[PDB]
Structure formats: structure tokens, C-alpha cells
């Protein structure tokens, strides 16, 4: 107690500049306000960079929601009309509670949030990337609530491992 698995996101490279901000001001502000460690890494491919967030369950969600706001706000200013999905990366070993019983908890979460949630096919991953991509289509507030309940279920697998 409490759980130590990070939230990993895949965000479009479009919106990374705004998430970091000028002089790294935006990202630092989010780490202060959420007490998180946020690190932005290139990803071998997709035109996306990964964002790793180590914090408490709640600060993680607070940080995720801020990133969703900034992404959506940035999407307005470059006239990006499409809905920007939230893509959570989750290690395959810890997705059993989401995909288990014909994806019951996945569809449960869909219904509770008004989101369309899709998980990348097992076959798509490599030995260099064991993380499944969980794509949540919705909107800022609905994607963030969806992140809370997805990461709850991912942490349930992790904390009931063996």
C-alpha cells in the first residue's frame, strides 16, 4: 500500500510542445500540482511520444486530466477537429481484469463513462514492447474518468499478481 505501477500514455507529437510548455513551465506546474514524476520519451513506431506518470492513483488521474485539457486546448488552436483519443499503455500481464470474461469490465467502464474503449490486439505487440495500447474515445472529462477506472482495474491485476 499504495500501488507503485505508473500510468503510461501515448500522446500525439503535435501536442507535446504544449504539454511541456515554454521553458518546461506547463509540465513542471503539473508535477507540482499533482506531486508526480512526468517523463516524455520518443517511441519506436504512429507519430506519438510516451508519457510516464509516477504518482498516487489520484494525482496520476489529476495529471492525466491536465494533459487531456492541454491536448484538447492545443487541438483548438491548430484547428484539429478530430477527437483526440486517450491512449493508455498497459503491460499485458496486468490487463486480465479488463479483457477477462469477454471484456466485462471494459464494457462496464464504457457504459459508466460514455466512452468507446478499444484494446490493441495481443498479436500487435513485440518483445521490445510488451504494453497493450488501450484507446479511449470520448472527451476531456469522460476520458479522465475512464482513465481512473481502467487504471483501477490494471492496478487490481498488478496487486493480485500471484
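Q: What amino acid sequence fits the structure above?
A:
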Amino acid at each position: 500500500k499504495p500501488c507503485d505501477l505508473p500510468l503510461r500514455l501515448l500522446v500525439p507529437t503535435q501536442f507535446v510542445g504544449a504539454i511541456i510548455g515554454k521553458e518546461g513551465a506547463t509540465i513542471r506546474n503539473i508535477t507540482k500540482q499533482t506531486q508526480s514524476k512526468i517523463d516524455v520519451h520518443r517511441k519506436e513506431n504512429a507519430a506519438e511520444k510516451s508519457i510516464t506518470i509516477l504518482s498516487t492513483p489520484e494525482g496520476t488521474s489529476a495529471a492525466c486530466k491536465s494533459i487531456l485539457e492541454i491536448m484538447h486546448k492545443e487541438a483548438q488552436d491548430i484547428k484539429f477537429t478530430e477527437e483526440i483519443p486517450l491512449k493508455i499503455l498497459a503491460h499485458n500481464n496486468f490487463v486480465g481484469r479488463l479483457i477477462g470474461d469477454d471484456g466485462r469490465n471494459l464494457k462496464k467502464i464504457e457504459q459508466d463513462t460514455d466512452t468507446k474503449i478499444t484494446i490493441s490486439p495481443l498479436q500487435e505487440l513485440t518483445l521490445y514492447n510488451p504494453e497493450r495500447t488501450i484507446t479511449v474515445k470520448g472527451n476531456v472529462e469522460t476520458c479522465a474518468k475512464a482513465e481512473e477506472e481502467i487504471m483501477k482495474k490494471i492496478r487490481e491485476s498488478y496487486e493480485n499478481d500471484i
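Q: And what stands out in the fold?
A: Helices lie at 16-20, 25-34, 57-77, 96-113, 140-159.
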